[PDB]
Design a protein around this ligand. Structure first.
Ligand code: ASN
Ligand code: CA
Ligand code: CA
Ligand code: CA
Ligand code: CA
Ligand code: CA
Ligand code: H2S
Ligand code: H2S
Ligand code: ZN
Length: 316
């Protein structure tokens, strides 16, 4: 909409007050003009038609329970945009400041969120498996990262390229969570998963097998469910990334941690400069070794650690 930029205030899904960039024209809309070509958040009104209606509010105060998922989708898209611009010199998901669109209140009881090729879409959860999914910063960043992947490597969402696609989303989702410094961890979705059970989440990058997922290539899923295991086999890659960052000894192979900033640089280069739509795990290793070679040199500790981490999870 055309109007003037303003700043509203509200509460998010976890009850935390925060300010949000809005636009006034008759109503106050969840339209942030401060970033790129805008960030726009929509109400899907429990339906599945998309995007729904641009979120309008009479008073620029977003404290209603119904408001909370919109507050967080909007705010965390902003944080994610800032991560990609400040850390990677990347302007929005297409690298050209494309407008970021999110819809909340998708369907009834819908226990997921996703990037659809044009926007972000968040369910409210069923109140037992999930609370509204935009309450998780890693969730929001996971979904915006799928947009980044679409515009760059284009990893097909099946089999090993799909598991890569998913891991990339978890890796950057987690790196945003650390960037924002909001109770950061190497788990995915813990802030919105299973209210009333503490300490759990959907997936763990530091210990995938906590939730049944593989942490070595020899345990990869080879069936047809889950688009050939894209959320299952992502554990193999998620573990390697966690080892590159944090270090450790896994299946007897010791990895020297090089930290989160370097992890992000290596994987962002690989994603943007080397991966392709059909990359498999082996090709991901090549890409990451090459990226770290470009950035640090062939004989560098960074290269060594990437190799160690991929060795540790059985990927040659
Ligand atoms: N964004 C999508 O289309 C996939 C979604 N992020 C998931 O992991 O199920
Ligand atoms: Ca209001
Ligand atoms: Ca956390
Ligand atoms: Ca997390
Ligand atoms: Ca829980
Ligand atoms: Ca599981
Ligand atoms: S670290
Ligand atoms: S390698
Ligand atoms: Zn995903």
């Amino acid at each position: 909409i055309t109007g003037t930029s303003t700043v509203g205030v509200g509460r998010g899904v976890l009850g935390d007050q925060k300010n949000i960039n809005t636009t006034y024209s008759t109503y106050y809309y969840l339209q942030d003009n401060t970033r790129g070509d805008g960030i726009f958040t929509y109400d899907a009104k429990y339906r599945t038609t998309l995007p729904g209606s641009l979120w309008a509010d009479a008073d620029n105060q977003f404290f209603a329970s119904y408001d909370a998922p919109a507050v967080d989708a909007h705010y965390y898209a902003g944080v994610t945009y800032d991560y990609y611009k400040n850390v990677h010199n990347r302007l929005s998901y297409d690298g050209n400041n494309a407008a970021i669109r999110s819809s909340v209140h998708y369907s009834q009881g819908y226990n997921n969120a996703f990037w659809n090729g044009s926007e972000m879409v968040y369910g409210d959860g069923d109140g037992q498996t999930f609370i509204p999914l935009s309450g998780g910063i890693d969730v929001v960043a996971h979904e915006l990262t799928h947009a980044v992947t679409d515009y760059t490597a284009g990893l097909i969402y099946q089999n090993e390229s799909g598991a890569i696609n998913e891991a990339i989303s978890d890796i950057f989702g987690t790196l945003v969570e650390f960037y924002a410094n909001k109770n950061p961890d190497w788990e995915i979705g813990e802030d919105v998963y299973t209210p009333g059970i503490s300490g759990d989440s959907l997936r763990s990058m530091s210990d995938p097998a906590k939730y049944g997922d593989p942490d070595h290539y020899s345990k990869r899923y080879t069936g047809t469910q889950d688009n050939g295991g894209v959320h299952i086999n992502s554990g193999i890659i998620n573990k390697a990334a966690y080892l590159i960052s944090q270090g450790g000894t896994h299946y007897g192979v010791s990895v020297v941690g090089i930290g989160r900033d370097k992890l992000g640089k290596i994987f962002y280069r690989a994603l943007t400069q080397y991966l392709t739509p059909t990359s498999n795990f082996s090709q991901l290793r090549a890409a990451a070794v090459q990226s770290a070679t470009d950035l640090y040199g062939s004989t560098s500790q960074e290269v060594a650690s990437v190799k160690q981490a991929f060795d540790a999870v059985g990927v040659k």
